[PDB]
Amino acid sequence: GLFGAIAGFIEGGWQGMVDGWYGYHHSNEQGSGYAADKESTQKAIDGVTNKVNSIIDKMNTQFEAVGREFNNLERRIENLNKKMEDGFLDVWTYNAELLVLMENERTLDFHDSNVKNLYDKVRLQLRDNAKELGNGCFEFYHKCDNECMESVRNGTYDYPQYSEEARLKREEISSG
Amino acid sequence: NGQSGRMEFFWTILKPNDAINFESNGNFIAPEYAYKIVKKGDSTIMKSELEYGNCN
Ligand SMILES: *[C@@H]1O[C@H](CO)[C@@H](O[C@@H]2O[C@H](CO)[C@@H](O)[C@H](O)[C@H]2NC(C)=O)[C@H](O)[C@H]1NC(C)=O
Ligand SMILES: *[C@@H]1O[C@H](CO)[C@@H](O)[C@H](O)[C@H]1NC(C)=O
Numbered sequence: 017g018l019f020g021a022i023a024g025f026i027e028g029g030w031q032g033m034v035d036g037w038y039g040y041h042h043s044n045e046q047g048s049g050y051a052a053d054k055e056s057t058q059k060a061i062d063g064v065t066n067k068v069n070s071i072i073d074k075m076n077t078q079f080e081a082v083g084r085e086f087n088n089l090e091r092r093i094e095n096l097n098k099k100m101e102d103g104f105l106d107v108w109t110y111n112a113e114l115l116v117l118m119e120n121e122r123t124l125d126f127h128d129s130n131v132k133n134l135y136d137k138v139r140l141q142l143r144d145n146a147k148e149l150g151n152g153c154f155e156f157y158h159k160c161d162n163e164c165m166e167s168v169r170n171g172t173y174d175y176p177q178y179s180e181e182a183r184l185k186r187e188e189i190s191s192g
Numbered sequence: 193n194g195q196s197g198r199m200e201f202f203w204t205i206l207k208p209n210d211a212i213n214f215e216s217n218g219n220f221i222a223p224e225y226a227y228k229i230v231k232k233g234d235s236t237i238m239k240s241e242l243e244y245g246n247c248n
Contacts, residue, residue: 083236 017128021135024128026152037061037127038134042165051169056130064123071115079104141173145182157182157189205229 017023033039036052037060081101086094135152146154158181160168167173199221206212206226214222 083239085237 018125019128019132021131022128038131040169044160046162053134056134060130067119078108138168145178157185
């Protein structure tokens with residue numbers, strides 16, 4: 017997409033995550049599993065719901081056609097009435113199709129933005145304490161248990177707490 | 193319909209406490225039955241070939 021997260025550096029989606037639109041997959045000594053950010057999913061759901069509501073009943077009064085009849089010697093006004101009603105119907109049909117097409121583009125890019133924003137949210141929290149693998153995954157330089165995983169997921173990762181342990185591992189890897 | 197003659201019909205709306213007066217000495221198609229507008233509201237004349245379907 018525009019932000020290059022969905023079908024981008026994250027090559028594919030996950031069928032194992034059913035409880036949310038976006039989330040994480042952790043794999044540590046205690047096991048592996050899926051989860052959700054619980055924030056981006058809520059913000060997206062409300063944002064998508066608001067968009068759908070803002071399209072449904074925003075037309076206020078889309079032109080309601082009314083049947084009118086004209087005799088044999090009123091062809092001009094009859095053709096005028098036919099053109100008028102057909103004109104409004106085409107205008108609103110164009111508005112309906114175009115709005116759906118344009119907002120569909122924004123909605124998918126909106127989902128793309130949220131994934132990249134979530135990816136940046138985790139990248140900026142870890143900083144150098146992990147290694148960016150380039151496919152949407154981060155490899156920790158320190159031990160991260162389940163509670164450590166939850167800290168990353170809910171935005172409360174303590175960088176200095178594991179900074180010294182990560183520095184020892186970064187030194188070892190760079191030294192060979 | 194087998195007739196070369198013509199019948200040209202006219203109508204009017206008679207408001208309350210208003211009187212309609214007729215005077216003719218020939219070719220008069222006199223009225224017998226009139227219609228009271230006993231309910232006004234939204235309606236339409238729908239041009240369709242279908243008929244009743246006993247539904248709501
Ligand atoms: C994010 O999740 C963590 C982990 O659940 C929350 O904090 C810790 O929770 C564990 C047990 O659930 C406690 O033993 C710790 O004392 C909690 N505090 C800390 C500082 O680790 C944390 O509170 C969550 N995020 C927010 C904003 O509250
Ligand atoms: C309605 O019509 C007459 C005049 O056309 C009016 O003077 C009279 O008050 C009304 N008739 C009756 C019967 O009330």
